[PDB]
Amino acid sequence: LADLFPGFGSEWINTSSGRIFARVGGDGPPLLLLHGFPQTHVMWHRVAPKLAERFKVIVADLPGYGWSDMPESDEQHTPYTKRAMAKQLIEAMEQLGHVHFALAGHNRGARVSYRLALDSPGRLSKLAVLDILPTYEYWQRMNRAYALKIYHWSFLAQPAPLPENLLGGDPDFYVKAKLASWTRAGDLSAFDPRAVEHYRIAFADPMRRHVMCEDYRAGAYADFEHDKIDVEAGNKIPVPMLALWGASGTPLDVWRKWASDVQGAPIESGHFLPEEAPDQTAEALVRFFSA
Amino acid sequence: LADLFPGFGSEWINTSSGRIFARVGGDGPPLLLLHGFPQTHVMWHRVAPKLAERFKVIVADLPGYGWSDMPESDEQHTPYTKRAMAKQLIEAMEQLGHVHFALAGHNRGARVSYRLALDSPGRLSKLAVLDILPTYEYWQRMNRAYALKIYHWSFLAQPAPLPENLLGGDPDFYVKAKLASWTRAGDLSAFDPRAVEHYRIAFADPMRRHVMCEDYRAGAYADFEHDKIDVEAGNKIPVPMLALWGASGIASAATPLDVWRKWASDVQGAPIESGHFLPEEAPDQTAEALVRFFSA
Ligand SMILES: [Ca+2]
Ligand SMILES: [Cl-]
Numbered sequence: 001l002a003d004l005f006p007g008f009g010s011e012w013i014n015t016s017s018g019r020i021f022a023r024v025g026g027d028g029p030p031l032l033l034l035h036g037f038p039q040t041h042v043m044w045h046r047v048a049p050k051l052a053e054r055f056k057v058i059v060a061d062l063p064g065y066g067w068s069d070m071p072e073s074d075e076q077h078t079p080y081t082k083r084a085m086a087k088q089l090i091e092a093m094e095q096l097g098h099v100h101f102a103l104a105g106h107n108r109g110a111r112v113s114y115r116l117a118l119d120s121p122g123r124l125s126k127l128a129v130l131d132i133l134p135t136y137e138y139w140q141r142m143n144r145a146y147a148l149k150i151y152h153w154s155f156l157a158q159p160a161p162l163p164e165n166l167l168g169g170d171p172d173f174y175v176k177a178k179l180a181s182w183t184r185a186g187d188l189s190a191f192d193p194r195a196v197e198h199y200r201i202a203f204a205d206p207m208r209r210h211v212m213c214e215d216y217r218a219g220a221y222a223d224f225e226h227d228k229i230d231v232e233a234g235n236k237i238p239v240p241m242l243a244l245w246g247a248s249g250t251p252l253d254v255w256r257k258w259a260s261d262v263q264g265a266p267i268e269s270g271h272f273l274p275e276e277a278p279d280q281t282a283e284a285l286v287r288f289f290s291a
Numbered sequence: 292l293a294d295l296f297p298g299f300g301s302e303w304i305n306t307s308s309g310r311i312f313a314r315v316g317g318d319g320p321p322l323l324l325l326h327g328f329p330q331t332h333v334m335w336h337r338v339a340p341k342l343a344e345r346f347k348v349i350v351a352d353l354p355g356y357g358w359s360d361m362p363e364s365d366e367q368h369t370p371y372t373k374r375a376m377a378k379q380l381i382e383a384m385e386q387l388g389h390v391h392f393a394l395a396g397h398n399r400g401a402r403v404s405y406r407l408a409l410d411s412p413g414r415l416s417k418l419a420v421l422d423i424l425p426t427y428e429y430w431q432r433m434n435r436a437y438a439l440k441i442y443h444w445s446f447l448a449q450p451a452p453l454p455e456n457l458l459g460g461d462p463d464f465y466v467k468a469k470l471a472s473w474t475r476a477g478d479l480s481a482f483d484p485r486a487v488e489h490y491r492i493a494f495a496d497p498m499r500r501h502v503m504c505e506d507y508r509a510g511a512y513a514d515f516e517h518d519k520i521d522v523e524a525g526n527k528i529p530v531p532m533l534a535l536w537g538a539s540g541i542a543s544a545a546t547p548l549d550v551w552r553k554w555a556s557d558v559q560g561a562p563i564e565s566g567h568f569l570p571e572e573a574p575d576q577t578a579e580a581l582v583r584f585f586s587a
């Protein structure tokens with residue numbers, strides 16, 4: 001496994017729920033970067049350098065993912081709820097003495113991020129979310145066309161062991177199919193092969209895959225309900241926020257419903273903005289987080 | 292594999308699209324029985340003897356299922372569309388000299404059946420559908436709770452070879468889990484173990500699995516488009532119809548009967564205490580309901 005972060009340290013950060021693994025580089029105001037599925041912190045390898053020109057950059061494995069520890073789940077999937085993951089990451093940032101920080105997330109990491117902003121807005125100076133809408137909104141959108149396009153939200157959420165049994169037969173195929181499927185190219189050409197190997201190695205462990213299904217189960221159940229409470233209470237994120245989305249991945253209209261100070265832009269990209277479109281993504285993040 | 296229809300004959304019926312395998316028995320008016328997923332013709336073995344006391348019973352493997360031939364599919368999943376399957380079975384019944392017949396279907400076979408009624412009503416005296424709503428209605432009703440409850444429609448419809456790869460690792464565990472999950476009890480108790488072994492053997496063949504995924508791909512795309520034309524046109528099935536469903540089955544807020552009255556101008560229906568698999572979970576009632584409906 002390659003080291004894709006030149007001049008970044010490696011840290012295991014203790015919390016009440018388990019260690020968080022992170023690469024740590026740069027100096028300046030703090031900025032936490034959060035990956036999603038089916039990836040690890042390594043998905044920021046092409047944009048983290050440019051950000052570390054200006055910021056202290058903490059590139060973390062989500063709870064249960066990568067090299068972060070795997071908290072024991074329960075019947076409500078609690079530790080893989082976005083609320084619980086945000087709590088845990090707030091504790092990890094406290095271990096570094098960071099109680100007010102900038103945050104960027106992609107995919108599941110972006111869900112942790114907007115949940116963090118809704119639960120504990122005082123922790124954040126600014127927030128960016130990459131190629132997501134809120135979990136509640138994707139579910140409200142779940143008609144035939146969405147059921148088909150985002151099938152994994154229902155499949156990965158089926159009760160255990162149904163997805164875990166299926167994924168065990170050829171995990172490398174499934175992780176690669178997901179990576180490829182959501183890019184513009186439709187193949188793995190946007191990805192550094194070294195990064196792909198990190199994603200494959202993680203995905204090859206049955207325990208890591210179970211956690212991913214627990215995350216999707218939370219996505220179907222508790223995370224949806226948590227979001228529902230906020231949309232019913234009329235709660236909006238007050239933190240200044242950026243919504244980036246892939247031309248092939250209006251979103252800004254959705255996020256204006258959820259957030260009182262939001263700006264946004266498309267990027268010519270599939271889902272995987274930091275790897276498909278690293279210059280445009282890095283440029284937009286530096287410009288937002290600098291201001 | 293066991294013979295679950297002792298005394299019934301066996302026919303391999305040629306058609307332009309491929310052979311249809313069937314068991315044939317009884318005497319009287321012709322009645323075609325069509326299974327669905329993940330099963331074969333054997334799922335009728337508990338009701339067939341009873342129906343055979345009053346009808347000439349033709350128990351057919353769907354195109355691509357069981358021992359029927361597997362046509363090569365295409366980008367629109369054509370041979371595994373219900374419209375194509377109906378055409379094919381019309382041909383198979385004409386090889387037997389049946390141009391006007393009664394029909395009962397379950398699951399995919401029920402979908403073939405109502406599409407056959409929409410396309411070619413003159414072929415049918417009467418039709419019964421077991422534990423389904425129209426494909427259009429499944430999709431239109433889609434929301435978070437239905438997506439989570441019945442996920443396989445969207446999963447198996449993913450582009451090849453994604454479901455095929457995932458199902459190839461441990462096919463037995465998937466087929467058996469589906470069978471159990473859809474019953475009232477949630478286990479395999481309702482099924483004769485010899486019938487389970489027919490289903491398992493069929494499912495163990497990668498080609499048969501690919502057919503089942505093409506059937507669900509048709510279900511997500513062309514079948515859905517064919518139904519949408521009909522419902523947007525206000526076309527109703529004119530053939531007298533029965534809708535039977537399981538109280539704990541797969542088939543809406545509205546009862547299934549109320550869904551079907553939108554699609555059919557002469558429809559009756561009833562629930563049975565059962566999961567999805569009416570002819571195995573509730574054979575006596577299912578047989579009774581059918582004999583009464585088709586004999587009236
Ligand atoms: Ca002939
Ligand atoms: Cl996501």
Ligand SMILES: [Cl-]
Nearest residue numbers: 131132133138
């Ligand atoms: Cl999203």
Ligand SMILES: [Cl-]
Nearest residue numbers: 423424429542
């Ligand atoms: Cl249905």
Ligand SMILES: [Cl-]
Nearest residue numbers: 573574575576
């Ligand atoms: Cl019964």
